[PDB]
Amino acid sequence: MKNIEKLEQSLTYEFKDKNLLIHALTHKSFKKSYNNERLEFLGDAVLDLVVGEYLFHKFAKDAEGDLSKLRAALVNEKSFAKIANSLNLGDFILMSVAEENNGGKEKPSILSDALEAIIGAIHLEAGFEFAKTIALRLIEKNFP
């Protein structure tokens, strides 16, 4: 994949298995029996823990507060698509010609899914703590 090195610089994480990252960037329309849906499923749960944990510590000395609402605001499709657009994910997602023609590169659900899949892939290769640091930095940079 061309310019993939630039995605890695943006994340500050370089994959040991480049095919894992490619897997994460493969939209379901692209190739039969090979896509990011499962990595997205895992990534979603990783981010739920990254964000829930961050909120538990940051709002610890405050009995008032709905951490669930605070989390939902941070991990929803719109926020994740914004983070993904900051990484120019649209340029790296592999999808069919027809899906590109259908505006697949800016679909927030496609962008959001791919970000989640990248975080799940980092968790698999480097572990939760490493994925957490990468995710928290992306969140910080987009929602100071």
Added chain:
Amino acid sequence: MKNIEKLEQSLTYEFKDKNLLIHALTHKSFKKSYNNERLEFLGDAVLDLVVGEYLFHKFAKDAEGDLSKLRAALVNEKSFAKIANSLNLGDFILMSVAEENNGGKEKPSILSDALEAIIGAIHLEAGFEFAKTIALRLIEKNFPQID
């Protein structure tokens, strides 16, 4: 608390800070401004990842399958209430006299929340991989798959 050593052996984990386990075991009815609600919130998320990951690997070769639905089947109130009872958490949970008279020790939501807060406590004290090992062990012991 009394018999706390029995719960630690059922869990196969000994807390460095005993007060954190007590906190996970403290129902919202017991003492003002001190309960296990935040730890339940944290543990629920820990459990979602532990089960999500277990499922990801288990069904890696099945193109067919709604992992989200299968996870819910594993982490719902009824499943956690069952794991909780295999730990006798009902004997350890701290709750007001009135709540205990209202059948609190057997309420599946109370049992479930306490389990989650405990897993959340472990994650906080020992890190995710450790919480994972404890959790996967508890799930396998209560719901062995076939195999």
